[PDB]
A paper describes a structure:
ERp44 is regulated by the ER–Golgi pH-gradient, which enables the protein to capture clients in the weakly acidic post-ER compartments and release them in the pH-neutral ER32. The present studies reveal that Zn2+ regulates the structure, function and subcellular localization of ERp44, providing a Zn2+-dependent mechanism regulating protein quality control in the ESP.
To reveal how Zn2+ impacts ERp44 conformation at atomic resolution, we determined the crystal structure of the ERp44–Zn2+ complex at 2.45 Å resolution by the single anomalous dispersion (SAD) method using the anomalous signals of Zn2+. The crystallographic asymmetric unit contains four ERp44 molecules, which form two homodimers (dimer 1: Mol A and Mol B; dimer 2: Mol C and Mol D). Zn2+ (Zn1 and Zn1′) is coordinated by three histidines (His299, His328 and His332) and a water molecule in a tetrahedral geometry (right top). Site 2 is formed at the center of the dimer interface, contributing directly to homodimerization of ERp44. Unlike metal-free ERp44, the Zn2+-bound ERp44 monomer adopts an open conformation in which the C-tail is released from the a domain and the client-binding surface including Cys29 is exposed to the solvent.
Numbering used by the authors:
A (entry chain C): 2 to 339, 349 to 358
B (entry chain A): 1 to 337, 350 to 358
Amino acid sequence: ITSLDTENIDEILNNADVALVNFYADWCRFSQMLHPIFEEASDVIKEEFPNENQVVFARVDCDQHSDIAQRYRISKYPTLKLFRNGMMMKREYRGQRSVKALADYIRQQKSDPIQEIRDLAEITTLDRSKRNIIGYFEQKDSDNYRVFERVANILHDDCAFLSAFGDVSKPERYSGDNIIYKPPGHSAPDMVYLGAMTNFDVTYNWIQDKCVPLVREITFENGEELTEEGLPFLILFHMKEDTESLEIFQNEVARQLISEKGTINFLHADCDKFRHPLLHIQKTPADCPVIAIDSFRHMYVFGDFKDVLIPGKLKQFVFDLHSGKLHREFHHGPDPTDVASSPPESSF
Amino acid sequence: EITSLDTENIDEILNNADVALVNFYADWCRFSQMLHPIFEEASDVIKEEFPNENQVVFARVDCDQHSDIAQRYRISKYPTLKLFRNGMMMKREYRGQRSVKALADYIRQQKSDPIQEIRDLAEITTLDRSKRNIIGYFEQKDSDNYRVFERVANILHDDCAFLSAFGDVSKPERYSGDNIIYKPPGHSAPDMVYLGAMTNFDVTYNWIQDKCVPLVREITFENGEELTEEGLPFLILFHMKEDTESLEIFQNEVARQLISEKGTINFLHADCDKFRHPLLHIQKTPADCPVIAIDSFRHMYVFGDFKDVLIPGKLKQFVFDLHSGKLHREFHHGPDPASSPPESSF
Ligand SMILES: [Cl-]
Ligand SMILES: [Cl-]
Ligand SMILES: [Cl-]
Ligand SMILES: [Cl-]
Ligand SMILES: [Zn+2]
Ligand SMILES: [Zn+2]
Ligand SMILES: [Zn+2]
Ligand SMILES: [Zn+2]
Ligand SMILES: [Zn+2]
């Protein structure tokens, strides 16, 4: 049960197929309760999963490395996060902190969610009220299959994943390995992915696009769970009758922000229900549509909504977050366009 | 020169410095990066006018490397410039321009003598009673007494006018030697005489500060930023503008229980009509008032039933639970007595 420093963390988590990370602090009484329990689970599991990088338990002293904790937006202790090959999973571990409960959790997360087809007839009897994604491969031992198996482990909660190999899948491989999305119901045709199947990012992107919405609604009921995903929010606040704002926002996010997809969460929020957050940026529902970023540290305002129509402005807003420009302008006021400087401000 | 400060050396360096100006910065703050040459230039200007060791000390704190020092002084944005006197942080933070002149003029005014010496005791009879006045009658200016007086006046000159009388002049009022006398506002208010040991800084400072600064202040839209800049958490009373009874109770109970905590907490009271939004943060409304809450700038913690202030020790325990981390633990994990995960609110 390893300890992650600011230098060895990327090496360790990337090489771990599954890693359960304990983000703790010494002053958290509940953190100290966990260290023996996290050790015992670590050994119960180290025996059931002996091989190198099958399951890897680590921990992060969030006092020592405030930057690491800031990276995954850890704000309270202890917080247990799941990583697959160095990528944090949306769903935080919120089960009980018992040696038993941790072990059962790792047990599930290590189970194979992919159903292997043994006869192509099975595809005609799939449950069409769920979404189904079928991967047709020459062989299971292929870079193609390994990318697919990664995507399936990340997304099994969102979609059913199936596989077929060799002689079974040959009739569907006229043009090589491919992936078929069977949409729910009977109203749309299958979509076929014949692209960069060794490319995790592109393949993950296409599959994920089929089974989670690009812009989700944040509500009181799902806010905490969305915060637990570890990313800042890019939010459109808008009235329910206001469908044009959402349409514009959805299109500009889809056109401009695909490369940023995994570093920020795209959300929309009913401005009547979110009157209080709108206060924090000196807005009322009458002011909507409003675009804002919520970095958890602060909430930053985009400007006139009609500026989303200007090409690249939405991208630049996201870029200004990650560059630190939005934070700087929040305490120090707008950067110069092209005498001596004032003190930083609480809100400005 | 600009001294870098870590945890191993922070208290030594600032304690020995009669005046220290500290630059709390962060490498990623562009205004911090701009400040570093101006800060070095200002210390060089001031090291010329103030040569002796610990006359004026310019130092800096990389708040990334030393998050705990930053937390100690409630630094939350950069660059923040604080003034210390012999290790004690002055409540007013440096808010002037970050230029060499503005810095230098500020250090020059802080080093200046704020006490006015009176040539004739006729000046105390004609003394302006629209103000708080403290008068020190001394044997000589080379006293140890006067140097404690000088130390207190340097800290509290913004809160009170300090006058001194020496030698032949003060001789009549020194029937019993050196003595300090407070003249409250209004020609009708009686004099209150200091009785403690004038060579004792801690004791003379506390008596003078009690006559100078009210124990409980009202936080308003105007002074909100200033109060935050004092670097102390808030123990605040939310009451209606007409609810004077709750306020009197609060002031009494604070004076009875919390004088030990006077330097670590800011005692405040606020009109809950004009602060409806912060009350909303603790699931309270003006109807729910009176409310007692601590604002720790991380979170806001509710005391419970306002009736419980009258139970001896319960208000003191509220503050103790803040410093012991108990309030923060219970905020994320629920009341103290396998484990449930932490929550952002319970
Ligand atoms: Cl915590
Ligand atoms: Cl900044
Ligand atoms: Cl800053
Ligand atoms: Cl805690
Ligand atoms: Zn907290
Ligand atoms: Zn905790
Ligand atoms: Zn609020
Ligand atoms: Zn900030
Ligand atoms: Zn800054």
